[PDB]
Amino acid sequence: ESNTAGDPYTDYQKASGSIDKAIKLEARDPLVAAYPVVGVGMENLIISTNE
Amino acid sequence: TAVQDSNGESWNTGLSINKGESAYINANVRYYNTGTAPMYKVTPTTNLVLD
Ligand SMILES: [Ca+2]
Numbered sequence: 001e002s003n004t005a006g007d008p009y010t011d012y013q014k015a016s017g018s019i020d021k022a023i024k025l026e027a028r029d030p031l032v033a034a035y036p037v038v039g040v041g042m043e044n045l046i047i048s049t050n051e
Numbered sequence: 052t053a054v055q056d057s058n059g060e061s062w063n064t065g066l067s068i069n070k071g072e073s074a075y076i077n078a079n080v081r082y083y084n085t086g087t088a089p090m091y092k093v094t095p096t097t098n099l100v101l102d
Pocket of ligand 1 (some may be wrong): 001002004011019
C-alpha cells in the first residue's frame with residue numbers, strides 16, 4: 001500500500017517530511033494518520049423576540 | 052323639532068417598532084497592511100461585539 005495509514009499522503013511523502021509543514025511531527029510516521037479532529041462549542045446564546 | 056349641526060377635528064400620531072430588528076448598524080472601517088507582501092482582493096472577516 002502506498003498510503004498505509006489511509007490519508008492523502010503516501011508513505012514517502014510522510015516519512016520524508018515533504019508535506020504541509022503545519023502537520024504535527026506525530027503524523028510523519030507512516031502509521032500515524034494525518035487526521036484533523038474538529039469540534040464546535042457554544043459559548044452563549046442570544047434571543048431576539050420579534051414582537 | 053330640533054336641528055343639530057356638528058363639526059369635529061382630530062389629530063393622531065403613532066409610533067411602532069419591531070423588537071427583533073429595532074435598528075441597523077453601519078460601521079466605517081479601514082484596512083491596514085504591516086507585512087512584506089501586497090494582498091490582492093482583500094476580504095476580511097470581522098466580529099461586531101457589544102458588551
Ligand atoms: Ca508502501
